[PDB]
């Protein structure tokens, strides 16, 4: 039998259209290798994106895979099975020197960011702060050594390998409330149909397991990601 997945081709490197009219990306390839694990014939469907979950809930399709964010918001109307990515449940507020009150982020002249990342996305959700974005986290660490802005917004896992380059600078933990945590991108199954999710749950580790996850990110440059939880 077939197992059918419901995607938005809008989304590169996780999915997007190719010169054949095809759908092609990250997601697709391990759709692919979540069908063989689960012994069926993939079947891709395009959907607008605000479409995709209310197919799944109606069972005309078995699977969501779209660059989709695991939020708790969504938690709540659907499983979701991680196969890529940092959960995001705080930021690295840096700066030089002391910061006695680091919040409110509304405090500073300007806030240092990466454009296209999630918390680019978070500061613009905030009223009252008035962002400095950069193409680089090169370039937002160098605004603030220069005193160019008073503080920079890192998600923690880049602030963890960067900062140890930067021993002028110190930091303080920003936390997210939770309706705004990011837990990593996920395949969207039904919540009728946890056993469906159980067995792409196992397909999701035998694939990480082989390498195979690991081969993937590689192929679809994953690690150099442009535009993160862009449907967040």
């Known amino acids: 039998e077939k197992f059918?997945?419901?995607?938005?081709?809008?989304?590169?490197?996780?999915?997007?259209?190719?010169?054949?009219?095809?759908?092609?990306?990250?997601?697709?390839?391990?759709?692919?290798?979540?069908?063989?694990?689960?012994?069926?014939?993939?079947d891709v469907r395009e959907f607008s994106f605000d479409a995709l979950i209310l197919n799944l809930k109606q069972h005309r399709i078995d699977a969501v895979i779209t660059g989709m964010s695991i939020t708790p918001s969504r938690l709540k109307e659907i499983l979701m099975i991680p196969y890529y990515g940092e959960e995001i449940k705080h930021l690295v507020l840096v700066f030089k020197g002391e910061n006695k009150h680091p919040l409110p982020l509304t405090q500073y002249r300007s806030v240092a960011v990466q454009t296209g990342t999630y918390q680019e996305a978070y500061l613009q959700s905030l009223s009252e702060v008035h962002i400095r974005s950069f193409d680089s986290t090169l370039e937002v660490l160098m605004e603030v050594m220069h005193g160019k802005s008073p503080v920079a917004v890192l998600e923690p896992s880049i602030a963890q390998v960067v900062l140890k380059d930067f021993p002028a600078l110190s930091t303080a933990t920003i936390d997210l409330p939770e309706d705004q945590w990011v837990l990593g991108y996920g395949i969207g199954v039904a919540s009728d149909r946890p056993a469906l999710a159980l067995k792409i749950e196992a397909a999701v580790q035998e694939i990480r397991k082989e390498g195979v996850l690991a081969e993937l990110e590689q192929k679809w440059g994953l690690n150099n990601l442009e535009h993160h939880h862009h449907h967040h």
């Open 4 to 42: 059918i997945v419901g995607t938005n081709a809008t989304y590169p490197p996780f999915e997007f259209v190719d010169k054949r009219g095809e759908v092609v990306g990250f997601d697709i390839d391990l759709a692919r290798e979540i069908s063989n694990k689960l012994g069926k014939t993939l």
